[PDB]
Amino acid sequence: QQMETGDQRFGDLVFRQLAPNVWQHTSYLDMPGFGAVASNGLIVRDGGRVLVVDTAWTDDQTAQILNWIKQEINLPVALAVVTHAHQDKMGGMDALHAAGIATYANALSNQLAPQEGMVAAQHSLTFAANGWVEPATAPNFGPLKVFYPGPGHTSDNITVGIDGTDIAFGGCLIKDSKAKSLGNLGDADTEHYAASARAFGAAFPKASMIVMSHSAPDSRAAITHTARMADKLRLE
Ligand SMILES: C[C@H](S)C(=O)NCC(=O)O
Numbered sequence: 001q002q003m004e005t006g007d008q009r010f011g012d013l014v015f016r017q018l019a020p021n022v023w024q025h026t027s028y029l030d031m032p033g034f035g036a037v038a039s040n041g042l043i044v045r046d047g048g049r050v051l052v053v054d055t056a057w058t059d060d061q062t063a064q065i066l067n068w069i070k071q072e073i074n075l076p077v078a079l080a081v082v083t084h085a086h087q088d089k090m091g092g093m094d095a096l097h098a099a100g101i102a103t104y105a106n107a108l109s110n111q112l113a114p115q116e117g118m119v120a121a122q123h124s125l126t127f128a129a130n131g132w133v134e135p136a137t138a139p140n141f142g143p144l145k146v147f148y149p150g151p152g153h154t155s156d157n158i159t160v161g162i163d164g165t166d167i168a169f170g171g172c173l174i175k176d177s178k179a180k181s182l183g184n185l186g187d188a189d190t191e192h193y194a195a196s197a198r199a200f201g202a203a204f205p206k207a208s209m210i211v212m213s214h215s216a217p218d219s220r221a222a223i224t225h226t227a228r229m230a231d232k233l234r235l236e
């Protein structure tokens, strides 16, 4: 079902295409106590296979994503990468595993997952001192370039860039350019957030479209605005 802003709504989910081979999947959870909070992930068509970034809030919603891919793209999903251990990102792991999809996550995310009430991914990504993922730990990721910017939204948020496009996924590290706060600061590293935000921008300097978890895709203005807000917080 197409809407005003060019977003196709598919059941309780919403899908928007960002590039010839990149879609953004959006799911909603009526959050206690807040309201209906949106969460964004990515779907990437890489040849004869599909790559998924982040699940939905629930197993059923993630299964709905899988149905959409089967219906709209019709290609086997090779792998999934989840960006950190919160429900909006890892709430539908069982749906992926029941579908036989190999799942990947930061080793710290997999370690933190039980405490965060999550199901861990099946494989662990580790990272070099400069932030880039060990290539041996992220095999055949195609156009996906995974980067750990340091502690920000959580101690474990990783970010993904997509080769061939100008799209980088900041996840819940980056907020939009009109955000007046940084949101859920429960697991946040207020001391290193700003550094992490700028590190992300430096990792993908040629990315002009920044996709984030809870807002529509923004420009690089979101990165500098986030880091600026993170500075204000750190300076008390
Ligand atoms: C404000 C934060 S980033 C949110 O929307 N959800 C946090 C969570 O999924 O646990």
Ligand SMILES: [Zn+2]
Binding pocket: 084, 086, 153, 154, 172
């Ligand atoms: Zn989170």
Ligand SMILES: [Zn+2]
Binding pocket: 086, 088, 172, 184, 213
């Ligand atoms: Zn979140």
